Design a protein around this ligand. Structure first.
Ligand SMILES: *[C@@H]1O[C@H](CO)[C@@H](O[C@@H]2O[C@H](CO)[C@@H](O)[C@H](O)[C@H]2NC(C)=O)[C@H](O)[C@H]1NC(C)=O
Ligand SMILES: *[C@@H]1O[C@H](CO)[C@@H](O[C@@H]2O[C@H](CO)[C@@H](O)[C@H](O)[C@H]2NC(C)=O)[C@H](O)[C@H]1NC(C)=O
Ligand SMILES: *[C@@H]1O[C@H](CO)[C@@H](O)[C@H](O)[C@H]1NC(C)=O
Ligand SMILES: *[C@@H]1O[C@H](CO)[C@@H](O)[C@H](O)[C@H]1NC(C)=O
Ligand SMILES: *[C@@H]1O[C@H](CO)[C@@H](O)[C@H](O)[C@H]1NC(C)=O
Ligand code: NA
Ligand SMILES: [Xe]
Lengths: 344, 180
């Protein structure tokens, strides 16, 4: 998954976008709006929870996002990209007692949080060490259009691996660089090191580096061109792997690789290619959507959303004309050529 | 393309029952518009009624969601997890470990709820699991609202919720999705 939080020039707006990467067989999609009346505690005297209203991208039968991308009535937007864990010495912290699965912790944090700090406080309890993600919590209540940095509260970043959760307010950093990008690699050095990524950088190079991997470099090169919602959608759908030098994998044959993009199209890599590790293979997997919101859209529990693999500069994915025509995809369109829609 | 359903509580019998259409007196209602052919998305709008306690609202939310999306649930199940730890699975070792892990984790949560009836945290966990129970019960066509402990099936609709958790449970349980 790729995500970008972008402060527009002059602080005019603050856009938040997320592009889920997943297997293509998962592309039955439901955008869900819940309006609940739950209370904070088990007695009628407790206040209503902060997160009773929420809109989120989801799937049939799945009572949370999974992507994840949520716009909460508390004024928060919460989203993540997955970091995983490569250090087998940490699996001992995954236990059935004393651990709540991540999907539950996510739902409970979204319901109770008033702000980024409280979201983190709730979420990190009983850390399961499963679905290990970098979470971004954007608090629009702390965002003033055209205003200077408030120094705190706007952006909180949380990273989870088994046995360790690190949290920091990154508002100053967002205002200094004008963006926060996320692309499946932990930002916190302690988490990067504990989860075994140094060995992978040593073995395979910059693809596993936080600052030098292809998506990091593409965001560094191009994020400033995001000047509005449409520009955000274009970047979040970006894949021009045949022509973009940042998409070259020097260890691969052929060198351009369709995984090395903001919105991956692994189906386009050749089946007989030579690749140094599995993520670079031909796979029925890649970017499968984009959701974008803004200060005003979020206020109205609204987003722009586009479903399916990117076709801006790549040929549209089509099941019957792909290597994957035999996989089950009940209910899905054959050809995926959809444009963004406003939701609701 | 569109379907609306409400879950009523018959105070007479104390029975929950689904009705077609919008009944703002109900415990919950939902409507689903399937625009997948046109836009690649379906849209679900779901509400619960604050006149009922939140436990019943949560269970009802699961029920009405399943009620308007049954076709989509079936297809998504077939597309994504129908073979996962099935009756013919070769990795019987892993599947047994997974099942044991999930059953113990679910039991541990049920115990914490029983041991902490005044905890806000465990109240929120219980609401989440009630919604999951209502989703599965409604899909199976038989409603039973629990007032105390309840058993979530480890490899039922829980499997639709744990796809991300499984990315780590697999290696953690030494087995031989979303992300890069
Ligand atoms: C994370 O691990 C890296 C790699 O081992 C550490 O970087 C090394 O740090 C030592 C001591 O300062 C240097 O002598 C090495 O040259 C560094 N190697 C590099 C940069 O690849 C780093 O210090 C660790 N960071 C934290 C916060 O634990
Ligand atoms: C929430 O409200 C429901 C509905 O009134 C309560 O459920 C009843 O609970 C009693 C036992 O205490 C049973 O005799 C009834 O059969 C239940 N009704 C149904 C429809 O199952 C429930 O006790 C209330 N509190 C909680 C925590 O659920
Ligand atoms: C790899 O397969 C492609 C696609 O059919 C084929 O055109 C090309 O000749 C192959 N290259 C090699 C090394 O086989
Ligand atoms: C549900 O019904 C309401 C009634 O006004 C309608 O406005 C809304 O568009 C419907 N939503 C879905 C998901 O079909
Ligand atoms: C997995 O295998 C390791 C051996 O390397 C063992 O120590 C550990 O207990 C195993 N974990 C489980 C849950 O089977
Ligand atoms: Na993810
Ligand atoms: Xe867990």
């Amino acid at each position: 998954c790729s995500a970008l939080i972008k402060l527009l020039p002059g602080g005019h707006d603050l856009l938040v976008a997320h592009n889920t990467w997943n297997s293509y067989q998962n592309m039955l999609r439901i955008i869900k709006k819940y309006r609940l009346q739950f209370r904070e505690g088990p007695q009628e005297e407790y206040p209503l929870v902060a997160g009773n209203n929420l809109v989120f991208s989801s799937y049939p039968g799945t009572i949370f996002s999974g992507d994840d991308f949520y716009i909460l009535g508390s004024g928060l937007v919460t989203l993540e990209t997955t970091i995983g864990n490569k250090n087998p010495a940490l699996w001992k912290y995954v236990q059935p007692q004393g651990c709540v699965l991540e999907w539950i912790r996510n739902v409970v944090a979204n319901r109770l949080a008033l702000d980024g700090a409280t979201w983190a406080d709730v979420f990190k309890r009983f850390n399961s060490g499963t679905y290990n993600n970098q979470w971004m919590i954007v608090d629009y209540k702390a965002f003033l259009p055209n205003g200077p940095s408030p120094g705190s509260r706007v952006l909180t970043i949380l990273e989870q691996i088994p046995g360790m959760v690190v949290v920091a307010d990154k508002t100053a950093e967002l205002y200094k660089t004008t963006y926060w990008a996320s692309y499946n690699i932990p930002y916190f050095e302690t988490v990067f090191n504990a989860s075994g990524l140094q060995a992978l950088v040593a073995q395979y190079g910059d693809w596993f580096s936080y600052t030098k991997n292809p998506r990091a470099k593409i965001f560094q090169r191009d994020q400033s061109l995001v000047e509005d919602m449409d520009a955000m959608v274009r970047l979040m759908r970006y894949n021009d792997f045949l022509h973009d030098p940042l998409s070259l994998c020097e260890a691969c044959n052929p060198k351009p690789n369709a995984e090395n993009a903001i919105s991956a199209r692994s189906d386009l890599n050749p089946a007989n290619g030579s690749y140094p590790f599995q993520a670079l293979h031909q796979r029925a997997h890649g970017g499968i959507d984009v959701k974008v919101t803004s200060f005003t859209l979020a206020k109205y529990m609204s987003m722009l959303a586009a479903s399916g693999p990117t076709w801006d500069q790549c040929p549209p994915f089509q099941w019957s004309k792909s290597p994957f025509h035999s996989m089950l995809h009940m209910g899905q369109p054959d050809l995926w050529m959809f444009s963004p829609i406003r939701v609701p | 393309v569109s379907r609306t359903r409400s879950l009523l509580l018959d105070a007479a019998s104390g029975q929950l029952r689904l009705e077609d259409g919008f009944h703002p007196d109900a415990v919950a209602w939902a409507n689903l518009t399937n625009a997948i052919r046109e836009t690649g998305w379906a849209y679900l709008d779901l509400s619960t009624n604050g006149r009922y306690n939140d436990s019943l609202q949560a269970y009802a939310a699961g029920v009405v969601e399943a009620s308007v999306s049954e076709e989509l649930i079936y297809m998504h199940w077939m597309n994504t997890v129908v073979n996962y730890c099935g009756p013919f699975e070769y990795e019987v070792g892993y599947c047994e470990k997974l099942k044991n892990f999930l059953e113990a984790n679910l039991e541990w949560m049920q115990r914490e709820m029983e041991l902490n009836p005044d905890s806000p945290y465990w109240h929120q966990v219980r609401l989440t699991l009630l919604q999951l129970k209502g989703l599965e019960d409604s899909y199976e066509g038989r409603l039973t609202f629990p007032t105390g402990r309840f058993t979530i099936k480890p490899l039922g609709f829980l499997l639709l919720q744990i796809s991300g958790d499984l990315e780590d449970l697999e290696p953690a349980l030494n087995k031989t999705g979303s992300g890069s």
